[PDB]
């Protein structure tokens, strides 16, 4: 199964290629705030699973599908993301929901 990102701000969906994808400041996600690194985190799609690893001093945030608050992620650790979960590159901004393919 594959994966795509759904911006919570109503931006168009972003498909994720198999393997690793660097996310952060850049055209892929349309992020311009300079508090987000151009190499802010890694997303890996492999064997039907998505995991995220924050790789910058400025953190990533995590919110599981059945929870209601963006929690800061442990730096440089992998976290598996299920369909319905969300992650973000700022605590209140640049939030993305995980969708599976097929859905």
């Amino acid at each position: 199964g594959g994966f795509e990102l759904q911006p919570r701000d109503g931006g168009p969906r972003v498909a994720l290629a198999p393997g690793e994808t660097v996310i952060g400041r850049g055209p892929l996600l349309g992020i311009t705030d300079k508090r987000v690194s151009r190499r802010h985190a890694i997303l890996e799609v492999a064997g039907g699973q998505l995991r995220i690893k924050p790789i910058h001093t400025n953190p990533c945030f995590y919110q599981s599908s059945e929870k209601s608050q963006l929690l800061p992620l442990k730096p440089n650790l992998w976290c598996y993301l299920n369909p319905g979960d969300s992650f973000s590159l700022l605590v209140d901004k640049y939030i993305f929901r995980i969708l599976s393919i097929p859905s």
Binding site: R25, G26, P27, I31, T32, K34, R35, V36, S37, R38, H56, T57, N58
Partner: peptide, 8 residues
């Protein structure tokens, strides 16, 4: 719009 060093 996407270039420039990151801020901490």
């Amino acid at each position: 719009p996407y270039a420039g060093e990151t801020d901490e």
